[PDB]
Symmetry: C3
């Protein structure tokens, strides 16, 4: 069994590793694979976006244990979700799993109430470790999901709002910068390729209007010059060959962007 592990606690001190110690105590045979622990502090949306493509990439016998949990020690509970692939996801019921479940939908869910899957005495400021990680490790060790607490309708899993890309009427699409690919400065939108229907495109945002060609990969434009492309996760992206589209055009996550032909 594999536990895929994400938090916003950072990798710069022992905290994230104390969770790993707990995993090994409960499930010594579980293989721990970090997703990241560098989610922006308290940023449930950034964390959930990071989780979107994890289900498709990991084996079906994976437990995804993930928390960005500024609600720790409150009425906000942790949930377990079995998705269509056979994976189990454990997380605060705060919208963290919105995109992972869009990608690979939930078939059953449960609320985590049983102390026998918790690390007691649970500390109020770290439910991330003592409820989420603890329960993920019990699932990895073979505890049945239904033994964590009551079933709950898939419909009661909290979701955060997602802005659809909208076709405007002439052929251009008004959408949104979903995230920055921060290592490189590439800009990832929510605009699907099949929504625009070796052509060129007009791209519009508050800062500017530029004409940019479409290519399959960075190297099909000269160093420093821009391209629109289809990114690894199926959506329209903006970049510069071996440069930072973020720094040059100052785009930001959440900025409305409008894209259309010629």
């Amino acid at each position: 069994p594999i536990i895929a592990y994400l938090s916003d606690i950072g990798n710069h001190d022992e905290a994230h590793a104390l969770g790993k110690g707990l995993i090994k105590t409960i499930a010594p045979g579980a293989e721990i694979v970090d997703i990241t622990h560098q989610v922006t502090p308290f940023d449930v949306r950034e964390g959930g976006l990071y989780l979107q493509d994890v289900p498709a990439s990991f084996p079906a016998n994976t437990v995804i244990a993930a928390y960005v949990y500024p609600e720790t020690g409150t009425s906000t509970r942790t949930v377990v979700v079995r998705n269509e692939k056979g994976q189990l996801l454990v997380a605060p019921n705060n919208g963290l799993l919105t995109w992972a479940l869009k990608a690979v939908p939930a078939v059953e869910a449960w609320e985590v109430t049983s102390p026998d899957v918790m690390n007691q005495p649970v500390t109020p400021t770290w439910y991330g470790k003592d409820v989420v990680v603890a329960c993920g490790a019990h699932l990895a060790a073979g505890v049945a999901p239904s033994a964590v607490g009551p079933k709950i309708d898939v419909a009661k899993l909290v979701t955060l709002p997602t802005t659809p890309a909208v076709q405007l009427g002439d052929g251009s699409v008004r959408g949104e910068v979903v995230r920055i690919d921060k290592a490189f400065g590439n800009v990832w939108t929510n605009i699907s390729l099949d929504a625009l229907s070796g052509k060129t495109l007009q791209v519009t945002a508050e800062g500017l209007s530029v004409e940019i060609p479409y290519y399959a990969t960075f190297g099909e434009v000269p160093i420093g010059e821009p391209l629109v492309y289809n990114n690894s996760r199926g959506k329209v992206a903006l970049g510069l060959n071996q440069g930072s589209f973020l720094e040059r055009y100052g785009v930001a996550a959440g900025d409305t962007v409008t894209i259309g032909l010629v």
Copy 2:
């Protein structure tokens, strides 16, 4: 067997991983779990604080291999310590293990002198890899601790000084900021809750004097507002709900802080 691994060498290049290569060469069956490699360069105190809670969180069959070793290649030796839980700790004898052993005390110790647990030819500027990690991997592979070198009285393990919290006489406690919880800006003191005996508290430091209520977790105060709480490791902490108490009040590690009722 689990090797829990900490250094100040960073995770930004291959150096920390070359230790992992050495572990796998000596003990292919050992599971490597990083603690962190981002300890501040040369900061034995920060490293040792990071190690304090590792013994309680990890299984008893764990070897804690840890170095912040600006004394590498000198007369400062490496030691092996068996603690009350059955874990083995390997580290420079430079105070790095002060807090881990406060938390879970040493029952026996040894000086590392036998070359058969060293990666020879030992390089003078990296005893961290060639003595500490190498010996940790031999311990993980089954080498007996007594085979590393001479026994030494627990009393000769080097410790760094620790400032006790002092009750002043009226009911307030003069203490010290032990560390900053850097991902979030929470401030961790050495003041125990049972030392202050839903109340409010006066907190005093050089920068300021403010009145702050006590709660069990961040979410019991509105976003942006301060709380005193009991942190996950048993000590009094200062934070802001989804904010940085460090940045707002400018507190620092090592600052004397005084806290008392109403």
Copy 3:
């Protein structure tokens, strides 16, 4: 089997971990050991330098899967190399493996052409995951190297240029700062000790000329003062005891440096 994994994609989000998911899907029994994912974006030279000492440190049954692949989705292919130790290396054929193969030379090589070792449909902007990592995992799972595609003469592996240290005639050596040891600010040159033949040395670069003694380790000079030493990888290095030689003298990677006796 061990997969040693390097990229320039960063560890701050899920991308590097999606490769790990793919590894576990193809080779669940493979142990994944990160080298680093913090190579500077697009910096093939920095990545290859990081890989130089990996072959010697890792077991012979290691697959080194490494990519800094700004050529992804282009005619630049991925290669498999068996080196003298029995390890397999998988990487873009773009010079990334120059130094790893200097250190432990290639005995056979192959071009990766067979789709049966690729993660199809390969995405054009991430050959790093879908060709390099995918093929590394198949090798770890037992696929034979010759089954990846056509053999190629070791001579056709792309290399990047390396500047030799040159003895100038009087006894001083003109060389080059190969890399900065970034955690600490130590300066690593390409000058061999046996090329200079408890003495003192004159060190010359554009910024300055200073006299610096030679010692085996940092602690043999007082805190804050400079030393020339032999670093862990066999070359002449410049540092300050518990300080940053980079910040004090402003040296940089690629700066010509000249060193000689008295």
